[PDB]
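User: Modeling request: complex.
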Amino acid sequence: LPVVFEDVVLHQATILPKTGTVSLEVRLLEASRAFEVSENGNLVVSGKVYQWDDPDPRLFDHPESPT
Amino acid sequence: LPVVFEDVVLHQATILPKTGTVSLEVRLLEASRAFEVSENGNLVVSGKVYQWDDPDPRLFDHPESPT
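Assistant: Request completed. Predicted assembly structure:
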């Protein structure tokens, strides 16, 4: 699956504890091409994710050097 | 449940069939306080819906008429 992300925003940083686990939940809206990651009911990440329909190898050609 | 809608948007109008039925699917992201209604996988309505924490009757008092 070649994927495309857009307008990714990180609202808060989750801190992994030394002992235990943290549960991260992902909810997708296929129609609106929007996603949302949450922890304990608190929004942590949001943006837009959808499949890349027509990949272009041109995109990954290395850009002209700053120097 | 006193509810508050916000930034509601309608993308298309569904034509109720004369014969048969039409099924609408609604999805909520409680963390983002957003909702989407999809018809056959097509976005129809979008916005933000959340519970009204502190209702106040003063809001519904009729504004004085300019005439």
